[PDB]
Every structure is written in C-alpha cells, then in structure tokens.
Write a protein that binds this ligand. Sequence first.
Ligand SMILES: C[C@H](CCC(=O)NCC(=O)O)[C@H]1CC[C@H]2[C@@H]3[C@H](O)C[C@@H]4C[C@H](O)CC[C@]4(C)[C@H]3C[C@H](O)[C@]12C
Ligand SMILES: C[C@H](CCC(=O)NCC(=O)O)[C@H]1CC[C@H]2[C@@H]3[C@H](O)C[C@@H]4C[C@H](O)CC[C@]4(C)[C@H]3C[C@H](O)[C@]12C
Ligand SMILES: C[C@H](CCC(=O)O)[C@H]1CC[C@H]2[C@@H]3[C@H](O)C[C@@H]4C[C@H](O)CC[C@]4(C)[C@H]3C[C@H](O)[C@]12C
Lengths: 323, 327
Amino acid sequence: CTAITLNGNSNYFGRNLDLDFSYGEEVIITPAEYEFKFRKEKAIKNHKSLIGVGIVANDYPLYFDAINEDGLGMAGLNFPGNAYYSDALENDKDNITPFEFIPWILGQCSDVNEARNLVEKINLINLSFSEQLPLAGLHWLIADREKSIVVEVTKSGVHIYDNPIGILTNNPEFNYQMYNLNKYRNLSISTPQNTFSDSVDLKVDGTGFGGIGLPGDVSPESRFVRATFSKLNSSKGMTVEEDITQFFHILGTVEQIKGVNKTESGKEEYTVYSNCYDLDNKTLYYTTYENRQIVAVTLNKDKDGNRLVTYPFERKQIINKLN
Amino acid sequence: CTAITLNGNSNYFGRNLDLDFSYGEEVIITPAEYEFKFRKEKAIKNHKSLIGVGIVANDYPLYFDAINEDGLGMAGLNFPGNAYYSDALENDKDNITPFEFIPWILGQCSDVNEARNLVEKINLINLSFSEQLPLAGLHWLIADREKSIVVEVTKSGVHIYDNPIGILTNNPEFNYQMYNLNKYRNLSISTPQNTFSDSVDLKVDGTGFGGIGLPGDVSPESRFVRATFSKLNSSKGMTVEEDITQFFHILGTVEQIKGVNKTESGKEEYTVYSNCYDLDNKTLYYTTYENRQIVAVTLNKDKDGNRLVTYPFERKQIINKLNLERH
Ligand SMILES: C[C@H](CCC(=O)NCC(=O)O)[C@H]1CC[C@H]2[C@@H]3[C@H](O)C[C@@H]4C[C@H](O)CC[C@]4(C)[C@H]3C[C@H](O)[C@]12C
Ligand SMILES: C[C@H](CCC(=O)NCC(=O)O)[C@H]1CC[C@H]2[C@@H]3[C@H](O)C[C@@H]4C[C@H](O)CC[C@]4(C)[C@H]3C[C@H](O)[C@]12C
Ligand SMILES: C[C@H](CCC(=O)O)[C@H]1CC[C@H]2[C@@H]3[C@H](O)C[C@@H]4C[C@H](O)CC[C@]4(C)[C@H]3C[C@H](O)[C@]12C
C-alpha cells in the first residue's frame, strides 16, 4: 500500500491498495444518521457523513479508506507483525476495535488536531469483526487539508507522528521510514555536476542522471522513498483537474503491476485500486487495475438518511473507440 | 522514450514519448494511395497503408511511431549525439532522410526480415524537413508479431541488432544497454533466501524484497532495465483486452511525471503520451499525460484514398462522473 497527500489548488489525500486479489470493494456512503455500533462503547446515532472505499458485511461499512463531510481523511494500510491490539480493556480509555477505528475518528472529528486528541485516549482492542474476517495488522494515515499524522499501535503503545511529507506505505515503523530518506539527500531532479573527480571527463548522454540511486522495486521502503521523491518534486498544476491528473501520476510511480511481486502463496501482488479524495470539495476519484478511466463521486451536503449507499466498482477497461 | 513489444493473446508494440513539451500530436492514417514524396528519390504513389502517431506538416505525415496494414511497426526514439546522417548522396543506394525513414520502411515492408534487407542498403542523409522542424538524432525499434530489431546509424555505419527482449530507450548504444542487464541477474520476483550469511537472522517484514537493486530513476539506462524487468515478468492475460491493460501498466513503470526530470532548458521532461498497437488487429490504443482514458483507432483497408486522415489528441481528463456537484 502507498498513501499520500497533496496540496495544490485544492487539497488531496488517497492511496494505492496493493493485494493479490480483490475483496469486491466498492464506494460506500455512510449517512449522518446510520447508527455506528461499537463492541465495547456506546453507539453513535448522529455523526459526520462519510464517503470511502471498502466492503459491507452484516450491514456494517468496513472501510479501507474514507473521508468525512469536513474533509478529514483516514486510510488503513498493512502493518504486519508490528501492529499490536490489546486483549485488556481500559477504564480510562475508549476501547475500540481496528475495524471500528475509521468510523470512531471520522464520525466525530473535523480535523487532524481533533483526531490526535481522540487517538490519544484510545485503546485498540483485539476483537475480530467475524470468524470469516479476522484482524490483520494495520497502521493509519490521518490527513486534513493542512497536514497529516501517522498512527501506529505496537507492543510499546499508541504512537502518533506528525507526517512532514504526507507519505505512508507498510513496514518498517514510521521513524525507520523517515530515517531511511536521509541517505538519498544527494538525489536530484537536474543533471548534477561531476563531483566524482575533476581529473576524469565524465559524459552525460541523456537526461535524468540526477535521480540515479532512487530505488525502483516494490518493497515498502523503496516505495516510501520513490513516492516521497515523486510527490515532493512534482510540478504544481494550474487547476484542480491538473492536480488530480498529477496525483494519479504520483501514485502510478509506486504502482505494483501483476508479475513483479509474487507472494509466499504464489499469488501476484498488484495495485487493486488507486484513489484521490478532493478534501475541500468532498469528492472521491478512483481507478482500478482493470480500468484506467477515473470515476468520480461527490459526497453531497444532503441529510442523506439511514442506510448505507453503495456504488460498485466496474472492473472493465472503458476504451474510447473512435473507429 | 521507451519502446516495448509484448506477445500475449495477440502481439503488441508501443512506446512512451518523453519530452518537455507537446508538438500537438495526433493519430495519422496514411492510405495506400497517398503519394509519398522523397527529397532525393522518386515518389511512391501506391504502398501499404499506415496508422500511427505524429504531426502533419506541409501535408506530410511526420510519424513519431507507426504500424502498417501487415502489422509491422516502427518507432523513432531520441538518440542524441550518436546518430550520424550522411552529408553525401550515394549513386547506388536510396538516399532517404530520417523523417522519410518510417514511410520508406513501413510503406514497402511486410515483416522484420524485409525491413532488415531494406535498412541494410539505405543511405540516411543529413537533410532537415524544414527550418521550423530541424533534425534530431534518432534510433529505431522495428517490430512485427514474431520478433524485433534495433537500427542505430552511427559514424561506424548502419548497425542492425536482433532485439531478444523487445525493449529500447535512448543512449547508450544497444550493445551497452544489453550488457548493462548482466549485473541485475540476481533480482527476483519472489522473496529471496538469505544468501548474505546464515550466521545472521535477517528478517523479511514485507513483500517485494526480491526486486531490491532495481533502479527507479528516469535515466535511459535505468528505464531500459526497469522496463525489461517489468515486461519479461508481467503476468499473462486471459484476453486481448487484459493484454492491452497490462501493456499500459508496463509502460507506466517507466513513465516520467512532471517535476522529477528537469532538462537543460529548465523545463520538465514528461511522458507526453503512451500507446499500444495491436499488431494482429492493426489497432492503435493510446493515452496522454492529461487523459487516462484509453482511446482506440483501427486501421481499415481503403485501397483508393489519397489524403491523410487525422484525429487530434484530447488533452483533457475524461472522468466518468457518477453525480453532479452543487457549487
Ligand atoms: C506543424 C504545426 C503546423 C501544421 C499543423 O498544424 N499540423 C498539425 C495538424 O494539422 O494537426 C505547427 C503549429 C504549432 C507549432 C508549434 C508551436 O508553435 C509551439 C512550438 C514552437 C517552437 O518554436 C517549435 C515547436 C512548437 C511545438 C511548434 C512546432 C510546429 O511548428 C507546430 C506544431
Ligand atoms: C521525442 C523526440 C525529441 C528529440 C529531440 O529533439 N531531442 C533533442 C536532444 O535530446 O538533444 C523525437 C521522437 C520523434 C521525433 C519527431 C519525429 O521523428 C517526426 C519529425 C521528424 C523531423 O525530422 C523533425 C520533427 C519531428 C516532429 C520529430 C521531433 C522530435 O525529434 C521527436 C518528437
Ligand atoms: C489486505 C489489505 C492490504 C494489505 C496486504 O497486502 O496485505 C488490507 C488493508 C485494509 C484491510 C481491510 C479493512 O481494514 C476493512 C476490514 C477490517 C477487518 O478487521 C478485517 C477485514 C477488512 C475487510 C480488511 C481486510 C484487509 O486486511 C485489508 C483490505
């Protein structure tokens, strides 16, 4: 997985979902008055309305990622081994399951400051959704229009990091991911000077020599570095459309194609979908592995009602045939 | 630039065009009876029909890349400094300009073997199209459904290489690009075993460790290696449509986004367009930097037309909007 933010004409947030199969994920809109029930806390009957991507099981929206009506985003990314969920409930904490974590935060908080304050009081508890959908290790990027934070709950406790670059992938932990960037300081967007030695006439026969050293594989660390370099140096767009276009190009730099990353089961890991949320305009844009054309759906300020509203992903290549 | 081939349910050929501006590119169909004029040779009034991408200037199709009615393709890629075009005309060879080279080959040749025999005997001459559109050094990938060759005309002469992998970018010369792959034999699609040392317990905390060492920058050598690794290992598709989808994913691994590659002029080099020709079905599919939706145009047999048929590129993001906003 790779999740990024982007600040331009509007403000954006989104992710690649990398996996060896599709869950049958879809757009899910949770209306303000859909009752959020929690396994160990009091139900929230009236909350901020959400739009996001995930599956519906037992009439409950299991979000992979989502934004709310205030333009606060949240995405769960794989964090295998490092994620620790506690078996013990705490009287002085809000005892919340990892699958309830997106509704808990996005239902109640309008920005990152309010998200941080609420995450500070949390205890992520080890209870699965069902026997069919057991818990997996996750960590979270939470982002609004100004900034973002990373939430990683491990054996040592609940860690919240300011994310200065708006990038997140998978393992290792976030301080290791940020430290890993330091050795790439010498990378450049331009042709560098010959600092190797002035006593040899080193020739440049092509553009893009500045980037030499940037890792190209699809391991989580290499994708963290490549996404950071691509995002931070990406050119500013003139419009919101140019920003969204540029956003999908940035996610395309760390996309996983079928064939290059075979898992232990022998299945091919690939970028199942890519999405971009316009946070100021409350609009989800997305693409799938099977369809390059961007699909858009706006969360409109309507008192929607009671029930989950879904728009299924269409996994067929929509080609404009000119004949 | 990166040009690749792919063999799946059908057989494919295509490229990324990497540049710091757009020429106003368009689909150009040249019918069989469009008279190809040549600066230093006799005009050809009847030939094979082409479909490809480029610009029209003075009613002449200036192809960036194209295919013909037999599914033979040809693409010109940037080859700065290494290309040598002759300043002298030969009395016993066809004196053809670089901008005439795609029509010269694709107009007359049905497969790679015929293209090679014609390329062997050519004299590429140092003549510009016009003052507005001067020559720049190129090298070519020529591909059919079976195989592909690389043409590099340098000071040492006309060099034709069998391309065993169906990959081409820019400098260096092709033997250097192919030799450069040898150091990456250790790369893998799966989590490798700890051969570093069994005296230390090295942990794997994520997928994709096998690829570590694959270069990720947009220099021509790094794109040559990354495109080769991505193309050769890419999964087989069930249908032709899945192959095309997969083809655009392969070109996307070596795409240049605006901002990461600042040229000498200070402008940003970017993938202006990507295309995929279905060679068996003679159909051009393409995308642009500004538009993610694939656009398709088929070459139809039309043995009597003598005028170029053109479809300009849409440089606007065509989004499938499910509902309207309230602004
Ligand atoms: C060749 C065409 C003119 C004929 C034509 O329009 N053919 C395509 C068609 O008919 O669709 C012209 C029109 C605009 C020109 C471009 C613009 O002036 C901008 C820019 C100016 C530079 O001096 C040289 C490169 C170029 C991209 C120009 C190259 C070329 O000089 C262009 C692209
Ligand atoms: C993307 C590169 C850019 C090459 C360049 O100018 N490099 C200078 C450099 O790197 O120093 C190539 C690929 C196909 C080329 C075009 C095609 O061959 C068709 C046509 C051929 C004419 O001889 C010159 C103009 C042009 C439009 C060419 C302009 C330009 O030549 C193109 C678009
Ligand atoms: C597996 C996948 C990505 C990581 C990877 O490559 O393993 C992760 C990221 C978000 C996850 C899903 C979301 O967190 C929503 C659900 C949460 C439930 O606790 C498990 C099922 C559930 C439906 C998850 C399945 C799976 O673990 C997802 C889809």
